[PDB]
Design an enzyme around this catalytic site. Structure first.
Site: not given
Ligand code: HEM
Ligand SMILES: Cc1cc(N)nc2cc(-c3ccc(OCC4CC4)c(CN)c3)c(F)cc12
Ligand SMILES: [Cl-]
Ligand code: HEM
Ligand SMILES: Cc1cc(N)nc2cc(-c3ccc(OCC4CC4)c(CN)c3)c(F)cc12
Ligand SMILES: C[C@H](O)[C@H](O)[C@H]1CNc2nc(N)[nH]c(=O)c2N1
Ligand SMILES: C[C@H](O)[C@H](O)[C@H]1CNc2nc(N)[nH]c(=O)c2N1
Ligand SMILES: [Ca+2]
Ligand SMILES: [Ca+2]
Ligand SMILES: [Cl-]
Ligand SMILES: [Gd]
Ligand SMILES: [Gd]
Ligand SMILES: [Zn+2]
Lengths: 403, 403
Positions: B107, B110, B279, B284
């Site tokens: 993430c 964070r 948000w 993304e």
């Molecule tokens: C506040 C603005 C936030 C932004 C801008 C953000 C951004 C991102 C991005 C870019 C990803 C990568 C997923 C992808 O690109 O496919 C991600 C993953 C993730 N986010 Fe954040 N996120 C936000 C808030 C949060 C919140 C509120 C939570 C939980 C309380 C959270 C928990 C996670 C988790 C669990 C993942 C997947 C990580 C993993 O699989 O190890 N995020 N986030």
């Molecule tokens: C709170 C939040 C905000 C944000 N701005 N983004 C977020 C993206 C993911 C996320 C986690 C794992 C993912 O992977 C999916 C694997 C294929 C099944 C993807 C999609 N790439 C998104 C997520 F959990 C939470 C997000």
């Molecule tokens: Cl998405």
């Protein structure tokens, strides 16, 4: 179970059986992955490495278990028992250098691994002879802009004699002058070898694109300074196909990427000097060398000239300027008729390589973070390819700087 | 023992002492790094996870070994002896949800981890109450475009009883439909849940951006089809600040990234339904969701409208069209007053997050491949930042589908 490896673009699944043969260990544990780290820091051990390499050779020519295979193994065992080391046959050296390339996890250009000119410099005996070998290499590989992959293999490390070493990290590098502000004029990546070149008598220039001399080390012998013939050093002026002011930036890059500071290891033998070269992928020049903040760091100047709103990140001026800088590089190399490959073709060729290697060897060591280009990553197919990183031998290895 | 971690733009070193606390085991071994893989792979066991999370919590509030500490420990002990499970105090739940976000290595957002709205839905039963909780969440988190991070925590898994599951991977998802040429109209990512919604009652739309219904599942019961009120789902029609034809492409995306298929693990307790939302980072949307070849795959459409040369890779039409899509995304969310962060701002903030976490608790688990944005990688400071990836608890984890 071997690691299941998925392609997320197509849904396709493979298993990397080849990783189960990784010998030397990497930096990761079940407790913590260090894949992002730039550096992961004698009779019988040599013999198993040698044996394995000989088996690799005889597999490649479809003659495993042959009379010659058995005899070459016995021959190597006899030489290691009498001398503590052994000599590669020429055919094994060629095979070894190509396998080392094939095995390089961070190399996106390994589609080409079987097309490698191996220059055998193993009877080289001085820094002057070295320089002559390097000039031949540069001449052959440049080929007046039609670049050809080459490696020149200098004598292997052996007890009771220092190493051949090329102090330069690449055969062709621009000087980087520690300007007295604490800033740098030229390439900041090359301040150290710039400092060492001057210290060894080189009269320095003052431009941003000054080709460094070579500091060549023959064994047990401080390095020796050699100036490259300027006509051997092919360079590309950078212009932009539509931004005519770009040419006034006075940007240049050189044609030949020729890494000279890694160590080639083949069947337990080490070759501390074995410079190798291919052709550039344009993001290396356009994005890293010219836009890295710790390199030429031109991103903001180009963007200001493009009349972009550099006051806020959300205009994506950085991405816009960087893209145009990469366009200029590709345009300029194509205009100069210097081989170059864009990150889209390179990564697509790498996808073909992975498929070849799955068939050929059941896997392919690949460092995802280095295979994915530094711009537009997910626009290239390698972004969506899960990859398994591991160390096979023969290998190119980083080695400490010889000073 | 403690990994050395270097920033290559700055030259700064830190050591990650937190990785020593890695609760679980990742996929990598000394033999092979699997970092790039998306999916790496009671009664006294419950106790030790529960004990150590309580220890964590009481450590974080500076009440280590104190009076309420001992009482809490004997409470969970007795609770699990009685029931086989225990109950979180509402503050432990808040702390566990925040820590699990703080710990989520992929993430990039964070820096926000301390500002999270936790909705205790642990008193839920039937899918109709699930739906009300979810709609309050959506309503609270959207906040008319000024997005606020939030999680809603439905009842924990327990022995004997089924689970609360949100079958949808996200609260807002566009349908994906197949036809007699194999292609997908809408979001290819959602062909599976679209078929399920269709099967379980939903009458399908026929647009590229039909917001799917919520398949919410109560313990042991089949999942019930719920439609989101249109006025609850804030969407942003995409237009470009200078490319007037972009709006006519009909692109849109939704304000609220709200992931609803992950499992929240706190102190040995498992919440198979705990949707959370923040948000968007613009890449993304603009790069991954709209430009991935297996998502909307609109890159070539946009490039054709920009009158780019699409028959050679070296014009970088993929890169130019990608950037303009991201510009459209940023401009359209800003113009609509919907919270959005561009990958430059976001990665600059995660650098700050790394620096605060270095001082707060010795390190920060981070998955470089997912932290580095999918466009302009090396233009962002996280590119030059070495990272360590490890699993802390509390944590969000992936889980099998409910089917
Ligand atoms: C506040 C603005 C936030 C932004 C801008 C953000 C951004 C991102 C991005 C870019 C990803 C990568 C997923 C992808 O690109 O496919 C991600 C993953 C993730 N986010 Fe954040 N996120 C936000 C808030 C949060 C919140 C509120 C939570 C939980 C309380 C959270 C928990 C996670 C988790 C669990 C993942 C997947 C990580 C993993 O699989 O190890 N995020 N986030
Ligand atoms: C709170 C939040 C905000 C944000 N701005 N983004 C977020 C993206 C993911 C996320 C986690 C794992 C993912 O992977 C999916 C694997 C294929 C099944 C993807 C999609 N790439 C998104 C997520 F959990 C939470 C997000
Ligand atoms: Cl998405
Ligand atoms: C033929 C065209 C080639 C292309 C387009 C190419 C491309 C690349 C690129 C882009 C990198 C990453 C460097 C960086 O991002 O800073 C790399 C690394 C590397 N390349 Fe290649 N290369 C080519 C030829 C070769 C040849 C001929 C050799 C050796 C015989 C070679 C061996 C290596 C090695 C050893 C590394 C880094 C160490 C590692 O792989 O772990 N490459 N290459
Ligand atoms: C033959 C060849 C062709 C090409 N087109 N490119 C190449 C790039 C590298 C290379 C390897 C590692 C690098 O980095 C060293 C990290 C510190 C350890 C760099 C510079 N980033 C370049 C290389 F060896 C060979 C290359
Ligand atoms: C910190 C990070 O590992 C480092 O900057 C790496 C990341 N990936 C890379 N990938 C390539 N191809 N070339 C590089 O120089 C780097 N640098
Ligand atoms: C194969 C690879 O792990 C996969 O494509 C990852 C890479 N990095 C990513 N990074 C982010 N932020 N989101 C993703 O979905 C992915 N996908
Ligand atoms: Ca001999
Ligand atoms: Ca048909
Ligand atoms: Cl270079
Ligand atoms: Gd022009
Ligand atoms: Gd037109
Ligand atoms: Zn790893």
């Amino acid at each position: 179970k071997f690691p299941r490896v998925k392609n997320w673009e197509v849904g396709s699944i493979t298993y990397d059986t080849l990783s189960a043969q990784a010998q030397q260990d990497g930096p990761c544990t079940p407790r913590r992955c260090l894949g992002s780290l730039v550096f992961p820091r004698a009779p019988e051990q040599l013999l198993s490495q040698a044996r394995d390499f000989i088996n690799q050779y005889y597999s490649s020519i479809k003659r495993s278990g042959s009379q010659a295979h058995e005899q070459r193994l016995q021959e190597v065992e006899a030489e290691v028992a009498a001398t503590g080391t052994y000599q590669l046959r020429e055919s094994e050296l060629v095979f070894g250098a190509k396998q080392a390339w094939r095995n390089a996890p961070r190399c996106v250009g390994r589609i080409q691994w079987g097309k490698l000119q191996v220059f055998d410099a193993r009877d080289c005996r001085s820094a002057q002879e070295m320089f002559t070998y390097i000039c031949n290499h540069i001449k052959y590989a440049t080929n007046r802009g039609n670049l050809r992959s080459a490696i020149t293999v200098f004598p292997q490390r052996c007890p009771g004699r220092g190493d051949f070493r090329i102090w330069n990290s690449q055969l062709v590098r621009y000087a980087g002058y520690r300007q007295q502000d604490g800033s740098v004029r030229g390439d900041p990546a090359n301040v150290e070898i710039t400092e060492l070149c001057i210290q060894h008598g080189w009269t320095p220039g003052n431009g941003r694109f000054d080709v460094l001399p070579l500091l060549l080390q023959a064994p047990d012998e401080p390095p020796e300074l050699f100036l490259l013939p300027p006509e051997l050093v092919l360079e590309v002026p950078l212009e932009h196909p539509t931004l005519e002011w770009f040419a006034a930036l006075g940007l240049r890059w050189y044609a030949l990427p020729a890494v000279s500071n890694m160590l080639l290891e083949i069947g337990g033998l080490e070759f501390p000097a074995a410079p190798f070269s291919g052709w550039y992928m344009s993001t290396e020049i356009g994005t890293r060398n010219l836009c890295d903040p710790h390199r030429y760091n031109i991103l903001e100047d180009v963007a200001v000239c493009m009349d972009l709103d550099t006051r806020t990140t959300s205009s994506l001026w950085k991405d816009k300027a960087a893209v145009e800088i990469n366009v200029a590089v590709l345009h300029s190399y194509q205009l100069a008729k210097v081989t170059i490959v864009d990150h889209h073709a390179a990564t697509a060729s790498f996808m073909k390589h992975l498929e070849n290697e799955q068939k050929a060897r059941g896997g392919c060591p690949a460092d995802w973070a280095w295979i994915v280009p530094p711009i537009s990553g997910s626009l290239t197919p390698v972004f969506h390819q899960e990859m398994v990183n591991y160390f096979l031998s023969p290998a190119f290895r980083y080695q400490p700087d010889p000073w």
